[PDB]
Amino acid sequence: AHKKGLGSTRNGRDSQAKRLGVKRYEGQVVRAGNILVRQRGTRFKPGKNVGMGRDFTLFALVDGVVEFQDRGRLGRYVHVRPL
Amino acid sequence: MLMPRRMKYRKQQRGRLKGATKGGDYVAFGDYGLVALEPAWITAQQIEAARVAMVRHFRRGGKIFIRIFPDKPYTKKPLEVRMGKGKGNVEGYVAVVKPGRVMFEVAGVTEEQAMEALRIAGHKLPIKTKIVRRDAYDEAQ
Amino acid sequence: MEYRLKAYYREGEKPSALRRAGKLPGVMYNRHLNRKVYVDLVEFDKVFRQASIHHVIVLELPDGQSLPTLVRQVNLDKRRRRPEHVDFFVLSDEPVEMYVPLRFVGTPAGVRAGGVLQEIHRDILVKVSPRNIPEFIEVDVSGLEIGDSLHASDLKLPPGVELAVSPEETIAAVVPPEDVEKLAEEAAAEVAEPEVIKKGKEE
Amino acid sequence: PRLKVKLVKSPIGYPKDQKAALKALGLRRLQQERVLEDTPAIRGNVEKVAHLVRVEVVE
Amino acid sequence: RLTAYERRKFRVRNRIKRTGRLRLSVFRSLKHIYAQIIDDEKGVTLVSASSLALKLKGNKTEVARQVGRALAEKALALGIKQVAFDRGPYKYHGRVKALAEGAREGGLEF
RNA sequence: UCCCCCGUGCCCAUAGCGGCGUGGAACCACCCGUUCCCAUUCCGAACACGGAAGUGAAACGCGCCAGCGCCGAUGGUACUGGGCGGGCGACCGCCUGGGAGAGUAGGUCGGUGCGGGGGA
RNA sequence: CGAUCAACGGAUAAAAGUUACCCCGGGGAUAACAGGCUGAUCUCCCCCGAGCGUCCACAGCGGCGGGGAGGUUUGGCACCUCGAUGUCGGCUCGUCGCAUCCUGGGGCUGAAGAAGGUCCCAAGGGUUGGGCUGUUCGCCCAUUAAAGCGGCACGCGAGCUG
RNA sequence: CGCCUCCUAAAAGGUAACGGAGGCGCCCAAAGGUCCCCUCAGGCGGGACGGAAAUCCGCCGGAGAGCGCAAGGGUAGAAGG
RNA sequence: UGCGUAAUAGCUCACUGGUCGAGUGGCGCCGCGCCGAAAAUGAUCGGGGCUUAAGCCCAGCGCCGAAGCUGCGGGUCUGGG
RNA sequence: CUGACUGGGGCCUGUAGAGCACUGAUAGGGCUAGGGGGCCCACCAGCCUACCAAACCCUGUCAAACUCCGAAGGGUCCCAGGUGGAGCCUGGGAGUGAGGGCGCGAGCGAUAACGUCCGCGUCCGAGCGCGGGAACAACCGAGACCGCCAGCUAAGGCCCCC
Ligand SMILES: NC(=[NH2+])NCCC[C@H](N)C(=O)O
Ligand SMILES: [Mg+2]
Ligand SMILES: [Mg+2]
Ligand SMILES: [Mg+2]
Ligand SMILES: [Mg+2]
Ligand SMILES: [Mg+2]
Ligand SMILES: [Mg+2]
Ligand SMILES: [Mg+2]
Ligand SMILES: [Mg+2]
Ligand SMILES: [Mg+2]
Ligand SMILES: [Mg+2]
Ligand SMILES: [Mg+2]
Ligand SMILES: [Mg+2]
Ligand SMILES: [Mg+2]
Ligand SMILES: [Mg+2]
Ligand SMILES: [Mg+2]
Ligand SMILES: [Mg+2]
Ligand SMILES: [Mg+2]
Ligand SMILES: [Mg+2]
Ligand SMILES: [Mg+2]
Ligand SMILES: [Mg+2]
Ligand SMILES: [Mg+2]
Ligand SMILES: [Mg+2]
Ligand SMILES: [Mg+2]
Ligand SMILES: [Mg+2]
Ligand SMILES: [Mg+2]
Ligand SMILES: [Mg+2]
Ligand SMILES: [Mg+2]
Ligand SMILES: [Mg+2]
Ligand SMILES: [Mg+2]
Ligand SMILES: [Mg+2]
Ligand SMILES: [Mg+2]
Ligand SMILES: [Mg+2]
Ligand SMILES: [Mg+2]
Ligand SMILES: [Mg+2]
Ligand SMILES: [Mg+2]
Ligand SMILES: [Mg+2]
Ligand SMILES: [Mg+2]
Ligand SMILES: [Mg+2]
Ligand SMILES: [Mg+2]
Ligand SMILES: [Mg+2]
Ligand SMILES: [Mg+2]
Ligand SMILES: [Mg+2]
Ligand SMILES: [Mg+2]
Ligand SMILES: [Mg+2]
Ligand SMILES: [Mg+2]
Ligand SMILES: [Mg+2]
Ligand SMILES: [Mg+2]
Ligand SMILES: [Mg+2]
Ligand SMILES: [Mg+2]
Ligand SMILES: [Mg+2]
Ligand SMILES: [Mg+2]
Ligand SMILES: [Mg+2]
Ligand SMILES: [Mg+2]
Ligand SMILES: [Mg+2]
Ligand SMILES: [Mg+2]
Ligand SMILES: [Mg+2]
Ligand SMILES: [Mg+2]
Ligand SMILES: [Mg+2]
Ligand SMILES: [Mg+2]
Ligand SMILES: [Mg+2]
Ligand SMILES: [Mg+2]
Ligand SMILES: [Mg+2]
Ligand SMILES: [Mg+2]
Ligand SMILES: [Mg+2]
Ligand SMILES: [Mg+2]
Ligand SMILES: [Mg+2]
Ligand SMILES: [Mg+2]
Ligand SMILES: [Mg+2]
Ligand SMILES: [Mg+2]
Ligand SMILES: [Mg+2]
Ligand SMILES: [Mg+2]
Ligand SMILES: [Mg+2]
Ligand SMILES: [Mg+2]
Ligand SMILES: [Mg+2]
Ligand SMILES: [Mg+2]
Ligand SMILES: [Mg+2]
Ligand SMILES: [Mg+2]
Ligand SMILES: [Mg+2]
Ligand SMILES: [Mg+2]
Ligand SMILES: [Mg+2]
Ligand SMILES: [Mg+2]
Ligand SMILES: [Mg+2]
Ligand SMILES: [Mg+2]
Ligand SMILES: [Mg+2]
Ligand SMILES: [Mg+2]
Ligand SMILES: [Mg+2]
Ligand SMILES: [Mg+2]
Ligand SMILES: [Mg+2]
Ligand SMILES: [Mg+2]
Ligand SMILES: [Mg+2]
Ligand SMILES: [Mg+2]
Ligand SMILES: [Mg+2]
Ligand SMILES: [Mg+2]
Ligand SMILES: [Mg+2]
Ligand SMILES: [Mg+2]
Ligand SMILES: [Mg+2]
Ligand SMILES: [Mg+2]
Ligand SMILES: [Mg+2]
Ligand SMILES: [Mg+2]
Ligand SMILES: [Mg+2]
Ligand SMILES: [Mg+2]
Ligand SMILES: [Mg+2]
Ligand SMILES: [Mg+2]
Ligand SMILES: [Mg+2]
Ligand SMILES: [Mg+2]
Ligand SMILES: [Mg+2]
Ligand SMILES: [Mg+2]
Ligand SMILES: [Mg+2]
Ligand SMILES: [Mg+2]
Ligand SMILES: [Mg+2]
Ligand SMILES: [Mg+2]
Ligand SMILES: [Mg+2]
Ligand SMILES: [Mg+2]
Ligand SMILES: [Mg+2]
Ligand SMILES: [Mg+2]
Ligand SMILES: [Mg+2]
Ligand SMILES: [Mg+2]
Ligand SMILES: [Mg+2]
Ligand SMILES: [Mg+2]
Ligand SMILES: [Mg+2]
Ligand SMILES: [Mg+2]
Ligand SMILES: [Mg+2]
Ligand SMILES: [Mg+2]
Ligand SMILES: [Mg+2]
Ligand SMILES: [Mg+2]
Ligand SMILES: [Mg+2]
Ligand SMILES: [Mg+2]
Ligand SMILES: [Mg+2]
Ligand SMILES: [Mg+2]
Ligand SMILES: [Mg+2]
Ligand SMILES: [Mg+2]
Ligand SMILES: [Mg+2]
Ligand SMILES: [Mg+2]
Ligand SMILES: [Mg+2]
Ligand SMILES: [Mg+2]
Ligand SMILES: [Mg+2]
Ligand SMILES: [Mg+2]
Ligand SMILES: [Mg+2]
Ligand SMILES: [Mg+2]
Ligand SMILES: [Mg+2]
Ligand SMILES: [Mg+2]
Ligand SMILES: [Mg+2]
Ligand SMILES: [Mg+2]
Ligand SMILES: [Mg+2]
Ligand SMILES: [Mg+2]
Ligand SMILES: [Mg+2]
Ligand SMILES: [Mg+2]
Ligand SMILES: [Mg+2]
Ligand SMILES: [Mg+2]
Ligand SMILES: [Mg+2]
Ligand SMILES: [Mg+2]
Ligand SMILES: [Mg+2]
Ligand SMILES: [Mg+2]
Ligand SMILES: [Mg+2]
Ligand SMILES: [Mg+2]
Ligand SMILES: [Mg+2]
Ligand SMILES: [Mg+2]
Ligand SMILES: [Mg+2]
Ligand SMILES: [Mg+2]
Ligand SMILES: [Mg+2]
Ligand SMILES: [Mg+2]
Ligand SMILES: [Mg+2]
Ligand SMILES: [Mg+2]
Ligand SMILES: [Mg+2]
Ligand SMILES: [Mg+2]
Ligand SMILES: [Mg+2]
Ligand SMILES: [Mg+2]
Ligand SMILES: [Mg+2]
Ligand SMILES: [Mg+2]
Ligand SMILES: [Mg+2]
Ligand SMILES: [Mg+2]
Ligand SMILES: [Mg+2]
Ligand SMILES: [Mg+2]
Ligand SMILES: [Mg+2]
Ligand SMILES: [Mg+2]
Ligand SMILES: [Mg+2]
Ligand SMILES: [Mg+2]
Ligand SMILES: [Mg+2]
Ligand SMILES: [Mg+2]
Ligand SMILES: [Mg+2]
Ligand SMILES: [Mg+2]
Ligand SMILES: [Mg+2]
Ligand SMILES: [Mg+2]
Ligand SMILES: [Mg+2]
Ligand SMILES: [Mg+2]
Ligand SMILES: [Mg+2]
Ligand SMILES: [Mg+2]
Ligand SMILES: [Mg+2]
Ligand SMILES: [Mg+2]
Ligand SMILES: [Mg+2]
Ligand SMILES: [Mg+2]
Ligand SMILES: [Mg+2]
Ligand SMILES: [Mg+2]
Ligand SMILES: [Mg+2]
Ligand SMILES: [Mg+2]
Ligand SMILES: [Mg+2]
Ligand SMILES: [Mg+2]
Ligand SMILES: [Mg+2]
Ligand SMILES: [Mg+2]
Ligand SMILES: [Mg+2]
Ligand SMILES: [Mg+2]
Ligand SMILES: [Mg+2]
Ligand SMILES: [Mg+2]
Ligand SMILES: [Mg+2]
Ligand SMILES: [Mg+2]
Ligand SMILES: [Mg+2]
Ligand SMILES: [Mg+2]
Ligand SMILES: [Mg+2]
Ligand SMILES: [Mg+2]
Ligand SMILES: [Mg+2]
Ligand SMILES: [Mg+2]
Ligand SMILES: [Mg+2]
Ligand SMILES: [Mg+2]
Ligand SMILES: [Mg+2]
Ligand SMILES: [Mg+2]
Ligand SMILES: [Mg+2]
């Protein structure tokens, strides 16, 4: 019977989710190498005993305890307090 | 009739209609107002019929303030098509209106003139309405 | 004039209980005091519709005290268009910012020509002594045509009262009226379709 | 003191975490009564299922 | 609006304090030169030396060098050895450089 | 331990903008030079060196002022975890716990650690 | 190092159509009929009263807009039925709804009379014969008080036609 | 039809529809490493040819510029020159 | 002010005089109802039938009511004796 | 003894709401480049505008792909309660990979569908066993080991059917 023609959608695309965010929260015991934050750019900055990778990934340089610090206009920092 | 001159996006999701009006709940300009008593998408056609009805009752004189604007695109699929194949086409524009919103205000006109013009205007809208007069409460806002 | 209003003290009563008993909840404050009050709604409404942040309201309290206040803020229930809470600002001896009613004297020549006087500001914000509060401020608008305007820089202020807004702020204007003769112009006025802001490689 | 907790309304149809709260209190049949110590951790589960339960202070 | 001076200083010193060493900060006025060895974890100065405090002679470059030796001698008697040089807003050159060379002659390790 | 200054941190504008005033003994700066080190896509402006006649004009430091900026309650409301009702619906209420944002009152022309020089 | 193995976890090194001559296994997991849910569309009824009607908003009309009802249209959905629920139109036989075509009773009229217009009540009965076309419908001829519209699986193929 | 960005996504992560919008299948021998130096867009005023916009000067101007290319995050106390 | 004439005239509203002798006219909000309300086999709130209810709103006391809970007896498994 | 769940403590978050500081939208007024038009002019300027109107300002608003703000909650770690047909490790055996209704949060649809597609929860599925809802998988009540001519209640009821 009378079925009308249709168009289509120029959309339908999206990329895979990237599983970003903080991975260890303040007060968690971590080992050297433990990734602490996954992020685009420096939403968090590396503090004491924390390195940063080429993709802004924050990881622990020593065994210890994660600590967060908000320094106002200077940004938010992730530290690792040695045990 | 009213619609945005430009926009960032052609089509908007539908959203909800919960709650009292966000702002625009007090008489801000004229002497009398027409307040929405229930929520709705008010169409640009409805606003223009409401405006013309007040202009025609005034003949010459007075001032109408339209305090809602239809910026929300209204979408409808072409007739006799099935579900799917993308979002419908924009057929018109609506203003979201929630209870307590002052949609129109009038000034420069007698009380009897305003009462009657706001009444005829209210008959063109898909919702119940109230006529109000500027108050000290309005002024203290 | 000088209005009076009985006020009462409240500690942990719930606002919805007070409002269900016909009482408007409120607060009293200045740099020295802050007290939770309530007034009677029908009593407050009788006074406020006249006094209205413009004129002084004296609060008679149950401890015998009486305090001269300005209504500083009225919170309205947006659904029902009803006051739900009042702020009473207890006046001291220093000056105070406040709104003094504007009073437009005379009929504009524009209004005679068919125009409409748009009272943009119906009061004006001002620093004045709480022993100096004028009833109003007259403004002659009889020389305004369509479309002239008046600003706060044209306010002839009484003595003791200093303007607390920018002198460039518009207070009144006389605008053209609604005209049915314009309708057919606006009806047969085609307005082109909305443009959508270019996104991506085309901008 | 202690809490006497009586299950008086069935958890059928209620979210599973409320069913777990009853298991943490040891309440498994209707009209069952348990006398539990009054600590903040036991009290948090009693309050969680307060709409199912009848409480009394005892001892 | 930061100045080129303040930007140069922040930039040089952030990089220094990243390495976690005690910093040898150097302030060079038109007349005098000054040095502090600073623990940035405690925000605390450990040993000082300057021309003004040693009431030192004429030629600013040799004065700077003697300031460095003086700082070294007092530093070692406290156990300090390794350090990071903080030229701050100045080029590594002349007076600052002399003070650094003078610190190294005295056994400060950097 | 108190006051001034010079370094250098911390809190992250209650610390800022603007206006006004103030300081050169000391310190700092401008300053005096461009031989020497070093330097300018040109320029001793900057960077750098050697100085010491002058000036606190610029900068900096220290006061005062609330026009701006920044901060900002109390009260009440929105919203809501959990618990219940109502409406054919769009949606609307009650209980208990939590509770903004805007705005009002008001606050602010910074506070503090360490070392160094000077002063009493 | 050689991949638009881009159908991008990439069947072969190497591949297109057609079937109304079709066949088997399955599915009401999925379409066409009919029902159902829905009611956009459809049909009908209202609200507002701009403006028409010489005069006069409302005899008769009703700009722009607003609210419903029905479930006869075209669809949406895919819920019973694909181990079968025969599908248009006609004939025959009815029966029901009423939003009434006629006949009966009314109000208003821009109702002199006669004849109309419009709305209200009313479903008892009645509602013709032909030309065309498969037609339903529609147009036309000749009449008529009138030549109503819909539902019943677009009523009725274990009743006929085809 | 694989991949990237945003939204839908209900403040962890994840989350569908033939839902709403865009991009990729490259590039760079510097557009890479390090050291040193430098700071934007924009507004106003001034300046031959010279203009809305070329280059010059002054004041204001915390980031609205820039970062090869979509979008987002990030960023001058540099990732920009 | 309404009704009328092409206009006219009119009767009249607003209006003021007298009689009468105490209330009258106009908004607005709340509870419960009225109309708006037409569809196809025979109707109906489940039926009968119900009106200071056997309806609706507020406040109570008692009872009825399941294979839920208790009492009594039994089985089986698990845990402890 | 590590579990679901719960107490306290820390950290992470950008939704509800709100807001307009950014990106856009936006009504009116003010101020004001640029145009339209009007006197005056070509000799290059000048005045006037109830015209359209950028920027800016005021008042008042809008936003999934806006955010100067921003909850309730949610997540995760630590310590504590929690002995449960809890949890963890290794290995044997599967079945399932057509879901469905309802509540709430959205998208799609038409602020349609016993519609459709996700999220949190629930029940049916497998509790078409039991009471209530006239009847009725998923609404209310409640998790049926067996027996009793015993008692108390739940939702719902207590004029008669009952
Ligand atoms: N935590 C709460 N009480 N939430 C209530 C949510 C709002 C609710 N629907 C009401 O209006 O009553
Ligand atoms: Mg069909
Ligand atoms: Mg179709
Ligand atoms: Mg396409
Ligand atoms: Mg898409
Ligand atoms: Mg793809
Ligand atoms: Mg993914
Ligand atoms: Mg996805
Ligand atoms: Mg993604
Ligand atoms: Mg995170
Ligand atoms: Mg690296
Ligand atoms: Mg890199
Ligand atoms: Mg901390
Ligand atoms: Mg630390
Ligand atoms: Mg939607
Ligand atoms: Mg609509
Ligand atoms: Mg739509
Ligand atoms: Mg679609
Ligand atoms: Mg659509
Ligand atoms: Mg429309
Ligand atoms: Mg609204
Ligand atoms: Mg209406
Ligand atoms: Mg406001
Ligand atoms: Mg009132
Ligand atoms: Mg591009
Ligand atoms: Mg229950
Ligand atoms: Mg149970
Ligand atoms: Mg239940
Ligand atoms: Mg729960
Ligand atoms: Mg939970
Ligand atoms: Mg039980
Ligand atoms: Mg109880
Ligand atoms: Mg200092
Ligand atoms: Mg410190
Ligand atoms: Mg000033
Ligand atoms: Mg100064
Ligand atoms: Mg001096
Ligand atoms: Mg001197
Ligand atoms: Mg030379
Ligand atoms: Mg020489
Ligand atoms: Mg020089
Ligand atoms: Mg120099
Ligand atoms: Mg000299
Ligand atoms: Mg000076
Ligand atoms: Mg001076
Ligand atoms: Mg300096
Ligand atoms: Mg002060
Ligand atoms: Mg803050
Ligand atoms: Mg605030
Ligand atoms: Mg509060
Ligand atoms: Mg809730
Ligand atoms: Mg609903
Ligand atoms: Mg609450
Ligand atoms: Mg509370
Ligand atoms: Mg909030
Ligand atoms: Mg606040
Ligand atoms: Mg300040
Ligand atoms: Mg300091
Ligand atoms: Mg000191
Ligand atoms: Mg000292
Ligand atoms: Mg492609
Ligand atoms: Mg494939
Ligand atoms: Mg292939
Ligand atoms: Mg690929
Ligand atoms: Mg894949
Ligand atoms: Mg292969
Ligand atoms: Mg192959
Ligand atoms: Mg081969
Ligand atoms: Mg092939
Ligand atoms: Mg073949
Ligand atoms: Mg053939
Ligand atoms: Mg064929
Ligand atoms: Mg053939
Ligand atoms: Mg054949
Ligand atoms: Mg054959
Ligand atoms: Mg053949
Ligand atoms: Mg064959
Ligand atoms: Mg077959
Ligand atoms: Mg087969
Ligand atoms: Mg078969
Ligand atoms: Mg399938
Ligand atoms: Mg089908
Ligand atoms: Mg079909
Ligand atoms: Mg079919
Ligand atoms: Mg059929
Ligand atoms: Mg069908
Ligand atoms: Mg059937
Ligand atoms: Mg239906
Ligand atoms: Mg309908
Ligand atoms: Mg319907
Ligand atoms: Mg329709
Ligand atoms: Mg109707
Ligand atoms: Mg009418
Ligand atoms: Mg006419
Ligand atoms: Mg007439
Ligand atoms: Mg007319
Ligand atoms: Mg009519
Ligand atoms: Mg119409
Ligand atoms: Mg409609
Ligand atoms: Mg309709
Ligand atoms: Mg039907
Ligand atoms: Mg049908
Ligand atoms: Mg129906
Ligand atoms: Mg269909
Ligand atoms: Mg159909
Ligand atoms: Mg279909
Ligand atoms: Mg089916
Ligand atoms: Mg389905
Ligand atoms: Mg079939
Ligand atoms: Mg068979
Ligand atoms: Mg069969
Ligand atoms: Mg058969
Ligand atoms: Mg029939
Ligand atoms: Mg009838
Ligand atoms: Mg008839
Ligand atoms: Mg008749
Ligand atoms: Mg006649
Ligand atoms: Mg007749
Ligand atoms: Mg008739
Ligand atoms: Mg009638
Ligand atoms: Mg009949
Ligand atoms: Mg009959
Ligand atoms: Mg008939
Ligand atoms: Mg015929
Ligand atoms: Mg024939
Ligand atoms: Mg013939
Ligand atoms: Mg025939
Ligand atoms: Mg025919
Ligand atoms: Mg035909
Ligand atoms: Mg024809
Ligand atoms: Mg005849
Ligand atoms: Mg007849
Ligand atoms: Mg039929
Ligand atoms: Mg049909
Ligand atoms: Mg059909
Ligand atoms: Mg049939
Ligand atoms: Mg038929
Ligand atoms: Mg048949
Ligand atoms: Mg047959
Ligand atoms: Mg047949
Ligand atoms: Mg048959
Ligand atoms: Mg048959
Ligand atoms: Mg038969
Ligand atoms: Mg045949
Ligand atoms: Mg034959
Ligand atoms: Mg997401
Ligand atoms: Mg998201
Ligand atoms: Mg998320
Ligand atoms: Mg994960
Ligand atoms: Mg597709
Ligand atoms: Mg593409
Ligand atoms: Mg290069
Ligand atoms: Mg510039
Ligand atoms: Mg210029
Ligand atoms: Mg020129
Ligand atoms: Mg230029
Ligand atoms: Mg940028
Ligand atoms: Mg009715
Ligand atoms: Mg009674
Ligand atoms: Mg029983
Ligand atoms: Mg049992
Ligand atoms: Mg026995
Ligand atoms: Mg037993
Ligand atoms: Mg047993
Ligand atoms: Mg067992
Ligand atoms: Mg344990
Ligand atoms: Mg654990
Ligand atoms: Mg917990
Ligand atoms: Mg929102
Ligand atoms: Mg904005
Ligand atoms: Mg604002
Ligand atoms: Mg919204
Ligand atoms: Mg919003
Ligand atoms: Mg969003
Ligand atoms: Mg948002
Ligand atoms: Mg603010
Ligand atoms: Mg804040
Ligand atoms: Mg939280
Ligand atoms: Mg979430
Ligand atoms: Mg938590
Ligand atoms: Mg969890
Ligand atoms: Mg926590
Ligand atoms: Mg434990
Ligand atoms: Mg189990
Ligand atoms: Mg298990
Ligand atoms: Mg086996
Ligand atoms: Mg399997
Ligand atoms: Mg399977
Ligand atoms: Mg499968
Ligand atoms: Mg599946
Ligand atoms: Mg399926
Ligand atoms: Mg599903
Ligand atoms: Mg499931
Ligand atoms: Mg069902
Ligand atoms: Mg649902
Ligand atoms: Mg509900
Ligand atoms: Mg939904
Ligand atoms: Mg969605
Ligand atoms: Mg609708
Ligand atoms: Mg479904
Ligand atoms: Mg649904
Ligand atoms: Mg839905
Ligand atoms: Mg489900
Ligand atoms: Mg199954
Ligand atoms: Mg069940
Ligand atoms: Mg189950
Ligand atoms: Mg069964
Ligand atoms: Mg049964
Ligand atoms: Mg049942
Ligand atoms: Mg039943
Ligand atoms: Mg029954
Ligand atoms: Mg059942
Ligand atoms: Mg059992
Ligand atoms: Mg009993
Ligand atoms: Mg009961
Ligand atoms: Mg009954
Ligand atoms: Mg009985």
PDB file of N, CA, C and O (backbone and C1' of nucleotides) in Angstrom, chain B residues 13-15, chain H residues 8 16-17, chain J residues 106-108 115-117:
ATOM      1  N   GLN B  13      16.290  19.216  21.659  1.00  0.00           N
ATOM      2  CA  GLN B  13      15.544  18.161  22.309  1.00  0.00           C
ATOM      3  C   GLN B  13      14.320  18.754  23.001  1.00  0.00           C
ATOM      4  O   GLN B  13      14.177  19.971  23.141  1.00  0.00           O
ATOM      5  N   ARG B  14      13.410  17.877  23.419  1.00  0.00           N
ATOM      6  CA  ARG B  14      12.109  18.360  23.873  1.00  0.00           C
ATOM      7  C   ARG B  14      12.145  18.866  25.313  1.00  0.00           C
ATOM      8  O   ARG B  14      11.461  19.836  25.645  1.00  0.00           O
ATOM      9  N   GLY B  15      12.927  18.236  26.171  1.00  0.00           N
ATOM     10  CA  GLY B  15      12.929  18.574  27.587  1.00  0.00           C
ATOM     11  C   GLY B  15      11.595  18.346  28.292  1.00  0.00           C
ATOM     12  O   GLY B  15      10.675  17.713  27.777  1.00  0.00           O
TER      13      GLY B  15
ATOM     14  P     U H   8      25.030  15.697  27.823  1.00  0.00           P
ATOM     15  O5'   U H   8      23.843  14.824  27.224  1.00  0.00           O
ATOM     16  C5'   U H   8      22.585  15.404  26.928  1.00  0.00           C
ATOM     17  C4'   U H   8      21.757  14.482  26.074  1.00  0.00           C
ATOM     18  C3'   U H   8      21.504  13.097  26.647  1.00  0.00           C
ATOM     19  O3'   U H   8      20.438  13.086  27.565  1.00  0.00           O
ATOM     20  C1'   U H   8      22.203  12.899  24.407  1.00  0.00           C
ATOM     21  P     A H  16      26.076   2.997  23.490  1.00  0.00           P
ATOM     22  O5'   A H  16      24.971   2.472  22.474  1.00  0.00           O
ATOM     23  C5'   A H  16      24.314   1.233  22.697  1.00  0.00           C
ATOM     24  C4'   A H  16      22.848   1.348  22.382  1.00  0.00           C
ATOM     25  C3'   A H  16      22.509   2.151  21.141  1.00  0.00           C
ATOM     26  O3'   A H  16      22.607   1.369  19.965  1.00  0.00           O
ATOM     27  C1'   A H  16      21.097   2.801  22.937  1.00  0.00           C
ATOM     28  P     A H  17      22.799   2.067  18.534  1.00  0.00           P
ATOM     29  O5'   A H  17      21.357   2.624  18.188  1.00  0.00           O
ATOM     30  C5'   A H  17      20.289   1.772  17.804  1.00  0.00           C
ATOM     31  C4'   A H  17      19.067   2.588  17.485  1.00  0.00           C
ATOM     32  C3'   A H  17      19.283   3.749  16.520  1.00  0.00           C
ATOM     33  O3'   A H  17      19.188   3.374  15.154  1.00  0.00           O
ATOM     34  C1'   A H  17      18.131   4.520  18.434  1.00  0.00           C
TER      35        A H  17
ATOM     36  P     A J 106      13.860  14.480  33.208  1.00  0.00           P
ATOM     37  O5'   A J 106      14.663  14.381  31.846  1.00  0.00           O
ATOM     38  C5'   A J 106      14.154  13.689  30.720  1.00  0.00           C
ATOM     39  C4'   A J 106      15.295  13.280  29.835  1.00  0.00           C
ATOM     40  C3'   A J 106      15.009  13.173  28.351  1.00  0.00           C
ATOM     41  O3'   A J 106      14.996  14.426  27.698  1.00  0.00           O
ATOM     42  C1'   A J 106      16.154  11.251  29.049  1.00  0.00           C
ATOM     43  P     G J 107      14.168  14.635  26.337  1.00  0.00           P
ATOM     44  O5'   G J 107      14.884  13.658  25.308  1.00  0.00           O
ATOM     45  C5'   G J 107      16.205  13.911  24.868  1.00  0.00           C
ATOM     46  C4'   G J 107      16.632  12.902  23.840  1.00  0.00           C
ATOM     47  C3'   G J 107      15.699  12.736  22.660  1.00  0.00           C
ATOM     48  O3'   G J 107      15.826  13.761  21.694  1.00  0.00           O
ATOM     49  C1'   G J 107      16.301  10.615  23.466  1.00  0.00           C
ATOM     50  P     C J 108      14.521  14.276  20.916  1.00  0.00           P
ATOM     51  O5'   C J 108      14.087  13.016  20.045  1.00  0.00           O
ATOM     52  C5'   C J 108      14.988  12.443  19.114  1.00  0.00           C
ATOM     53  C4'   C J 108      14.418  11.206  18.478  1.00  0.00           C
ATOM     54  C3'   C J 108      13.006  11.319  17.936  1.00  0.00           C
ATOM     55  O3'   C J 108      12.942  11.985  16.687  1.00  0.00           O
ATOM     56  C1'   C J 108      13.205   9.326  19.167  1.00  0.00           C
ATOM     57  P     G J 115       3.479  -0.254  24.439  1.00  0.00           P
ATOM     58  O5'   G J 115       3.314   0.556  23.076  1.00  0.00           O
ATOM     59  C5'   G J 115       3.307  -0.119  21.824  1.00  0.00           C
ATOM     60  C4'   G J 115       4.137   0.587  20.769  1.00  0.00           C
ATOM     61  C3'   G J 115       5.649   0.539  20.914  1.00  0.00           C
ATOM     62  O3'   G J 115       6.212  -0.674  20.475  1.00  0.00           O
ATOM     63  C1'   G J 115       4.992   2.715  20.307  1.00  0.00           C
ATOM     64  P     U J 116       7.403  -1.343  21.306  1.00  0.00           P
ATOM     65  O5'   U J 116       8.779  -0.857  20.662  1.00  0.00           O
ATOM     66  C5'   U J 116       8.889  -0.368  19.343  1.00  0.00           C
ATOM     67  C4'   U J 116       9.922   0.724  19.273  1.00  0.00           C
ATOM     68  C3'   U J 116      11.126   0.599  20.202  1.00  0.00           C
ATOM     69  O3'   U J 116      12.117  -0.324  19.750  1.00  0.00           O
ATOM     70  C1'   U J 116      10.300   2.810  20.270  1.00  0.00           C
ATOM     71  P     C J 117      12.993  -1.175  20.806  1.00  0.00           P
ATOM     72  O5'   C J 117      14.166  -0.180  21.194  1.00  0.00           O
ATOM     73  C5'   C J 117      14.943   0.448  20.188  1.00  0.00           C
ATOM     74  C4'   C J 117      15.872   1.450  20.805  1.00  0.00           C
ATOM     75  C3'   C J 117      16.466   1.036  22.139  1.00  0.00           C
ATOM     76  O3'   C J 117      17.574   0.176  22.015  1.00  0.00           O
ATOM     77  C1'   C J 117      15.599   3.211  22.332  1.00  0.00           C
TER      78        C J 117
END
